[PDB]
Nucleic acid binder design. Structure first.
Lengths: 88, 135, 70, 74, 64
RNA sequence: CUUGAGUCUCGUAGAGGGGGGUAGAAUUCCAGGUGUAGCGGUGAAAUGCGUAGAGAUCUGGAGGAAUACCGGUGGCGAAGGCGGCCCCCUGGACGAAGACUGACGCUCAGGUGCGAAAGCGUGGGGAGCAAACAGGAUUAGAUACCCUGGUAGUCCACGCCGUAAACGAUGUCGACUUGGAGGUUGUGCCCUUGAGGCGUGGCUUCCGGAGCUAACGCGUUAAGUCGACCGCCUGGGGAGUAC
């Protein structure tokens, strides 16, 4: 769950190029910001197993693109975990 | 903020006691950096069935751009008000660039398109005058 | 049953084609029966398979037209 | 030449352009029975997209207690 | 029954009717025809069968 | 590397979900008027309802459940499934065009969640229908079909094992591909070719060559051809029963 201007602000200062919409890192930053809002939606909409399934799909994909980034170089993958705050 | 449209109703006894309300609602929305995109009074209308054992009530329409919390607050205020006797609210709406477009259909409801449970003659002396060449 | 009407006090005007609401009308199918979410379209295709006397005459009209033999 | 003779809510941009609204109660009277029921696509001269919009506006207006909704009333 | 009902109100000096109908039964036009022919005045025919917006679950008889 | 795969911009339809609200219609129930002896249920009634005032008709009040039309082999959802109207929040899809990333992909034992109905623990609720229970009828009998009567149940909130002709019977995913017509629906361009057409892209109903094909048929969305991975069968009963 994300506003269009919020999505825009994510790629404003992430992305590997002018009008990048495809880089691994920004895909995973926008997926984090979706997850964090959608977890907070399904918190009160406890029987919405549409949103639950959409939430699952997002965190799975984000984990597979974190894995793709750790497959490239591990230091940028842990830099993204730094830059998004994720896990303890 | 969001574009809206609002209908609401008050009693027949209140069909000349509504302009003081239309003032207050205007001042709430302009107070909120919101604007009136259209304003119409549909007058006393006859009802296909009586609401609260009376066959007519008085209709108004506002069409606005306003912050969503004004329209949260006001639709619920109506839903707690006993003088305001029924509403409808619609999301994401603007006026026609025509003036009085709904008035010409108010004219039609009051003429051919109800079951007239109380006489046509008392309710039709309310709200916007049906100058059909504007609308 | 009798509606309201353009008819001359209908019992004397032999109109029959439309003059019901439920009474041998299509909404009688779940009226006086259980609710069944699926049944009423399945029940068209199933009924027709036993309803062979009307079926076969319409079938004969269209296939005989379609051959240029009619 | 240009333009050619269009059919009901067909071949054209400025009819049925926006969705059929419940405030426009004047058009809705055209499309209802003597028991205040909806008329289908096959009679109205319109397709599925417009019928969905029509049947909504009719519904809205009836629950506003402004249009007939059965053969009976008080 | 329609004739016996015309006789039932005979004493109130009524003669003019209009007509209202409900129910699936066939007592709906033979009644009117013999009523108008039994010295009474039929003038209007309107149905008053009540119909719902879906409503409550119908009964089942004979597994119909 | 961008072609597979993924992502945003942007166009767009939808009974997709969760939370809340609302209008009118109706079956029921209560009170009372009016009226007066009938009513009801079946093949027949009987049981049952009435004169202690029924039925029918009028008006006031009360409850709980559900949305007639629209409606289509239509539209949407992972499937299970999803149908009155309003708001709030919200997943998914599809598509004319813009680009971007740079094979990041695909399946999947085990695992984890979902999963019609019935069910059951918990609390609430009790209009309608109706397991159980009670009575009636029928019949040779009738513990049944049929009728009179009717509790639980359903519906609301919370929690639990989960099963189904979960029969679109065809594991998931992909490429290859005879033809045609209907519906539905996104789109560029234009004499809206006439009708909007036409290409084009998505879904789906129907038909069908060839192929496949015990057979019905199926049949380019194959019951086809080909690849990866994963599940099932191996005579019948014992038996998904036992342990």
């Amino acid at each position: 769950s994300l506003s269009t201007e919020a999505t825009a602000k994510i790629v404003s200062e992430f992305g590997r190029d002018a009008n990048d919409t495809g880089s691994t890192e920004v895909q995973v930053a926008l997926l984090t910001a979706q997850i964090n809002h959608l977890q907070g939606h399904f918190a009160e909409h406890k029987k919405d197993h549409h949103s639950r399934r959409g939430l699952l799909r997002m965190v799975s994909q984000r984990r597979k693109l974190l894995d793709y980034l750790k497959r490239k170089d591990v230091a940028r993958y842990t830099r993204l975990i730094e830059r998004l705050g994720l896990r303890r | 903020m969001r574009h809206y449209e609002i209908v609401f109703m008050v009693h027949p006894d209140q069909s000349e006691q509504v302009p003081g309300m239309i003032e207050r609602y205007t001042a709430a929305i302009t107070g909120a950096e919101g604007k009136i995109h259209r304003l119409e009074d549909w007058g006393r209308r006859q009802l296909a069935y009586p609401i609260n054992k009376l066959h007519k009530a008085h209709y108004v329409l506002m069409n606005v751009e306003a912050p969503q919390e004004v329209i949260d607050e006001l639709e619920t205020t109506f839903r707690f008000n006993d003088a305001v006797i029924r509403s409808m609210v619609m999301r994401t709406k603007h006026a026609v660039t025509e003036a009085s477009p709904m008035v010409k259909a108010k004219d039609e409801r009051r003429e051919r398109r109800d079951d007239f449970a109380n006489e046509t003659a008392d309710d039709a002396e309310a709200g916007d005058s049906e100058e059909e060449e504007e609308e | 049953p009798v509606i309201k009407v353009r008819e001359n006090e209908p019992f004397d005007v032999a109109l029959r084609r439309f003059k019901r609401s439920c009474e041998k009308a299509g909404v009688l199918a779940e009226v006086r029966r259980r609710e069944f979410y699926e049944k009423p379209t399945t029940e068209r295709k199933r009924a027709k398979a036993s309803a062979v006397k009307r079926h076969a005459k319409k079938l004969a009209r269209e296939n005989a037209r379609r051959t240029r033999l009619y | 030449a240009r333009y050619f003779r269009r059919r009901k809510f067909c071949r054209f941009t400025a009819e049925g352009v926006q969705e059929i609204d419940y405030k426009d109660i004047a058009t809705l009277k055209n499309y209802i029975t003597e028991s205040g029921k909806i008329v289908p696509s096959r009679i109205t001269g319109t397709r599925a997209k417009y019928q969905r919009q029509l049947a909504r506006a009719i519904k809205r207006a009836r629950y506003l207690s402004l249009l007939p909704y059965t053969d009976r009333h008080q | 029954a329609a004739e016996r009902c015309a006789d039932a109100v005979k004493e109130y000096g009524i003669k003019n009717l209009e007509v209202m109908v409900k129910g699936p039964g066939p007592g709906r036009e033979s009644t009117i025809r013999a009523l108008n022919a039994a010295g009474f005045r039929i003038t209007n025919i309107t149905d008053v069968t009540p119909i719902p917006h879906n409503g409550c679950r119908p009964p089942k008889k004979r597994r119909v």
